Structure 1
Amino acid sequence: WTGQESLSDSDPEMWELLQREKDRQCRGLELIASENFCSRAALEALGSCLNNKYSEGYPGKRYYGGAEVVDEIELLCQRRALEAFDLDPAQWGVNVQPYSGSPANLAVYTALLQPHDRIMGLDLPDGGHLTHGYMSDVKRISATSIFFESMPYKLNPKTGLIDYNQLALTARLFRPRLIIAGTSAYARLIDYARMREVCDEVKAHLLADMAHISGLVAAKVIPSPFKHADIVTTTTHKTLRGARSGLIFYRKGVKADPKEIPYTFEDRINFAVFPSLQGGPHNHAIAAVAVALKQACTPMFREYSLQVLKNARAMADALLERGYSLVSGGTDNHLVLVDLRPKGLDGARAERVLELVSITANKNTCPDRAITPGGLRLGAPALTSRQFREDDFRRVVDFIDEGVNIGLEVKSKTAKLQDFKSFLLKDSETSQRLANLRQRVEQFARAFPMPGFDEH
């Protein structure tokens, strides 16, 4: 044994699964708003020998030896992170050790708040993420709602946009210590200036979770939350097109003067990441993130982010011009909140019909009330990374419309949901129409190239 044998030679069962998943991504229309195809450069660093190094601590303040190289890799990733978002190192610092977005947010709350302190985030059916403090009326869901006290703010159901007024009213009553200005299913731009006004009045922290729009902010394509927020959290995949990781941007320097009150975020943020919450940093992921952060400063990323908008706007217009209404009307970022209620089909079996035909999306709750949500959430960054353009996404919408029409035609002879999915696999007529649409769907997708490796 050497440990240098190939995966195909040593573990062929796993290697086959790699090729199947690689073929599924190549043959399919990936429309999940949070997915993206990582570049081979970053994947080579993700599966590197950096996995072998225990480097707990921070550059200069580490606990082991032999960390001289990972210190430079972490510092480079920190430096590349600040300039992908045009930040002054004297005003902003970044932590690159969060394992993902969920751990990154939990580190922010642990750093700045005591247990049971109050947070306010956008509710989950209203577009906010789990880690913004989601608890239903029956059960505490996210640990952000267990270890901290959470009251959600909602959208205006007539407007489809964030009810900034109701937020401000409930904010002085609830008195949160931190408000999260970040979304997972929201097509408009967040008024960070209005968020900072609410935060300055109730004397809370303004955390911006830019996970979904991190690439659009890096490319100076949409307005940046760094102008108003004290702490910014992000995933490194999604629009940043990197490995699965997380980052925590914090403000450093002087804050305010009663007679130079400094910012006290850095030491708390860093201590919450390690040793409070996480153990050993994943240096292979940190390097893959630095690779993608370098690609974010390049002019091709500005052209890439600009293309994701145009194709998200094209997908929005194409869906409107086929009858589909969209929550908030259209989009301003990378995703489209489609409303399938004015069509007679939910978001549940509509996803199952599209999934059966190599089109990946997810059900999304629209401004209704169970297992059959309102519409779906369609994303552009994934396919745009295969040089999809406006005309390409118009075929995507038409391919989706055919799936919806089959979905409306299976609710024909089915009752609930199990009746639906069983018919799509049982009756020979429905399966062939789905299979026929699959060959045409997979044929259109395979033609575009795929970032990353070739067979895995």
Structure 2
Amino acid sequence: WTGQESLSDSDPEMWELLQREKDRQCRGLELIASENFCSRAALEALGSCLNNKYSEGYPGKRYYGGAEVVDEIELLCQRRALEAFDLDPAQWGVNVQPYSGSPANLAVYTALLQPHDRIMGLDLPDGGHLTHGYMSDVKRISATSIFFESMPYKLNPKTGLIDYNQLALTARLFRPRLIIAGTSAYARLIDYARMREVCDEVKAHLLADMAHISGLVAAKVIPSPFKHADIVTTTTHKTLRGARSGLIFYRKGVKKTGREIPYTFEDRINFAVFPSLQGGPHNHAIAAVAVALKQACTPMFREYSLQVLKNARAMADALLERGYSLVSGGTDNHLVLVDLRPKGLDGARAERVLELVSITANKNTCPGDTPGGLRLGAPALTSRQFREDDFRRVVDFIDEGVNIGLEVTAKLQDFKSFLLKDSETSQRLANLRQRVEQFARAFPMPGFDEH
């Protein structure tokens, strides 16, 4: 044994599973708004010798030695993080060590708040994320709701937009220390101007969770929340098309004596990440992020992202011109909130049938009473150089599924079994999927060819 043997030679059971997933990604249509396809250049760094480096601390202030190279890699990933969103190194700093999106959020709460301090984030069935402080009416779900006290602000069931007035009303009754301006299922764009005015009034921190829209924000297509938020957190995948990791952007520098009142985010944010919450950084993921961050500064990524919104807008209209209602009436980002029960069926039903024909989406609760819609995502297939005509065949493929969906019971377990057990329906199953797989494989696929 040397440690240099190939994966296909040493672990053939795992190699087959790698290819089964590589084939599944190639053969299907990916419409989960949070997923993408990482470049091969980043994956080469993700699976590199940087995994063998314990570098606890930060460049300059590391717990031990040997960090000659990973310091430059962390600093380069920091330099590339501020470039990808155009930020002055005197007004903004970045922490590239968070393991993922959820760790990056909990690191901000630990840094700026005390245990049981008050948190305000958009509710989960209304389009917010778990880490925004989601607890149900029976349990505290996210640990962000355990170690901190969270009250959600809901969607206006009329416009489908954020009830920016009910928020300001409750924000003075709740008196939170931080409010999260970010979403996981929301087609419109966040009015960061209202969020900052609400925050600056009740004297709360404005945190922008731009994980879903980080790529779009980098390409300067949608308004950047860096003009209003003191703290900006994001994943490095979703639309940024990078390895799974996280980032924390924070204000830096100087925010009646005549003495400058300085920003106090850097030292606290860095200390909460290490040594408070995390141990050794994942330097392989850090370098892979720097690779994908450099790709975001390129004109190609802007042309890519501009194609995502066109693919999302053309998908939205292609849904519309068939008789589909869109929550908020349309899309201005990368994903469409399809309101499905005006057509006669819900989300949990549509998402299963689409999955069986190699079309991946997620049910999402729409303003209503079993969820009533889907969250269809452009950025995944857009990275396969999809175009407006291609997504129109995707929506026509999705929609042959929903038309089966309206024809496929009573319960959801019957709906489930009737999909695969009904022999006559089971043969239309292989029919629709075979042409979806035949249509999807023809497009290119980023990353390695084999795995």
Stretches of structure 1 that go unaligned for 5 or more consecutive residues are none
Q: CA deviation at 1:427?
A: 1.5
Q: CA deviation at 1:428?
A: 1.0
Q: Partners of 1:259 and 1:355 in 2: how far apart?
A: 60
Q: Partners of 2:395 and 2:11 in 1: how far apart?
A: 40
Change in CA separation of 1:120 and 1:256 when aligned onto 2, cut-off 3 Å: farther
Q: Secondary structure at the match of 1:239?
A: coil
Q: CA deviation at 1:258?
A: 5.8
Stretches of structure 2 that go unaligned for 5 or more consecutive residues are none
Identity %: 99
Render the CA deviation track for 1:169-219: whole Å, top value 9, x for unaligned: 000000000000000000011111111100100000000000000001101
Q: CA deviation at 1:344?
A: 1.4
Change in CA separation of 1:103 and 1:256 when aligned onto 2, cut-off 3 Å: farther
Q: CA deviation at 1:405?
A: 0.9
Q: Secondary structure at the match of 2:281?
A: coil
Q: CA deviation at 1:17?
A: 0.6
1:81-100 alignment, distance < 5 Å: 81-100=81-100
Q: Partners of 1:257 and 1:217 in 2: how far apart?
A: 38
Q: Partners of 1:191 and 1:418 in 2: how far apart?
A: 40
Q: CA deviation at 1:259?
A: 5.7
Change in CA separation of 1:356 and 1:149 when aligned onto 2, cut-off 3 Å: same
Give the structure-1-normalised TM-score. Answer: 0.98
Q: CA deviation at 1:64?
A: 1.7
Q: Secondary structure at the match of 2:73?
A: helix
Change in CA separation of 1:230 and 1:392 when aligned onto 2, cut-off 3 Å: same
Q: CA deviation at 1:409?
A: 0.9
Q: Partners of 1:279 and 1:340 in 2: how far apart?
A: 45
Change in CA separation of 1:5 and 1:250 when aligned onto 2, cut-off 3 Å: same
Q: CA deviation at 1:255?
A: 1.0
Change in CA separation of 1:295 and 1:256 when aligned onto 2, cut-off 3 Å: farther
Determine the structure 1 residue equivalent to 2:123.
123
Q: Secondary structure at the match of 1:377?
A: strand
Q: Partners of 2:263 and 2:343 in 1: how far apart?
A: 52
Q: Partners of 1:381 and 1:47 in 2: how far apart?
A: 24
Q: CA deviation at 1:257?
A: 5.5
Q: Secondary structure at the match of 1:77?
A: helix
Render the CA deviation track for 1:414-440: whole Å, top value 9, x for unaligned: 220110111111121111101100010
Q: Partners of 1:429 and 1:66 in 2: how far apart?
A: 65
Render the CA deviation track for 1:66-116: whole Å, top value 9, x for unaligned: 111000000000000001000000000000000000000000000000000
Render the CA deviation track for 1:292-338: whole Å, top value 9, x for unaligned: 00000000001000000000000000001111111111100000000
1:233-272 alignment, distance < 5 Å: 233-255=233-255, 260-272=260-272
Q: CA deviation at 1:267?
A: 0.3
Render the CA deviation track for 1:314-372: whole Å, top value 9, x for unaligned: 000000111111111110000000011111111002100000000000000000xxxx2
Q: Partners of 1:43 and 1:248 in 2: how far apart?
A: 22
Change in CA separation of 1:256 and 1:296 when aligned onto 2, cut-off 3 Å: farther
Q: Partners of 2:308 and 2:349 in 1: how far apart?
A: 27
Determine the structure 2 residue equivalent to 1:51.
51
Determine which of 373, 381, 384 is the counterpart of 2:379: 381
**Greater Cα offset, 292-301 or 319-328:** 319-328
Render the CA deviation track for 1:102-161: whole Å, top value 9, x for unaligned: 000000000000000001000001100000000111110000000000000011001100
Q: CA deviation at 1:247?
A: 0.1
Q: Secondary structure at the match of 1:94?
A: strand
Determine the structure 2 residue equivalent to 1:278.
278
Q: Partners of 1:433 and 1:407 in 2: how far apart?
A: 12
Q: Secondary structure at the match of 2:165?
A: helix
Q: Secondary structure at the match of 1:423?
A: helix
Render the CA deviation track for 1:19-39: whole Å, top value 9, x for unaligned: 010000000000000000000
Determine the structure 1 residue equivalent to 2:330.
330
Q: Secondary structure at the match of 2:45?
A: helix
Change in CA separation of 1:256 and 1:99 when aligned onto 2, cut-off 3 Å: farther
Change in CA separation of 1:378 and 1:213 when aligned onto 2, cut-off 3 Å: same
Q: Secondary structure at the match of 2:249?
A: strand
Q: Partners of 1:126 and 1:174 in 2: how far apart?
A: 19
Render the CA deviation track for 1:344-403: whole Å, top value 9, x for unaligned: 111002100000000000000000xxxx21100000000000000101000000001100
Render the CA deviation track for 1:231-256: whole Å, top value 9, x for unaligned: 00000001100000000000000019
Q: Partners of 1:417 and 1:64 in 2: how far apart?
A: 56
Q: CA deviation at 1:449?
A: 0.5
Q: Partners of 1:356 and 1:323 in 2: how far apart?
A: 24
CA contact (8 A) 1:28 1:359 kept: yes
**Greater Cα offset, 250-259 or 40-49:** 250-259
After superposing on structure 2, the runs of 4+ consecutive aligned residues of structure 1 that deviate more than 4 Å are 256-259
Q: Secondary structure at the match of 1:240?
A: coil
Change in CA separation of 1:71 and 1:300 when aligned onto 2, cut-off 3 Å: same
Q: Secondary structure at the match of 1:15?
A: helix
CA contact (8 A) 1:207 1:229 kept: yes
Q: Secondary structure at the match of 1:137?
A: coil
CA contact (8 A) 1:313 1:332 kept: yes
Q: Partners of 1:197 and 1:421 in 2: how far apart?
A: 47
Change in CA separation of 1:337 and 1:134 when aligned onto 2, cut-off 3 Å: same
Q: Secondary structure at the match of 1:451?
A: coil
CA contact (8 A) 1:365 1:374 kept: yes
Change in CA separation of 1:256 and 1:53 when aligned onto 2, cut-off 3 Å: farther
CA contact (8 A) 1:219 1:302 kept: yes
Render the CA deviation track for 1:30-74: whole Å, top value 9, x for unaligned: 000000000000000000000110000000000121111000000
Q: Partners of 1:195 and 1:258 in 2: how far apart?
A: 29
Q: Secondary structure at the match of 1:328?
A: helix
Q: Partners of 2:406 and 2:372 in 1: how far apart?
A: 14
CA contact (8 A) 1:256 1:262 kept: no
Q: Secondary structure at the match of 1:74?
A: helix
Q: Partners of 1:375 and 1:427 in 2: how far apart?
A: 25
Change in CA separation of 1:259 and 1:36 when aligned onto 2, cut-off 3 Å: closer
Q: Partners of 1:308 and 1:381 in 2: how far apart?
A: 6
Aligned pairs, how many? Answer: 449
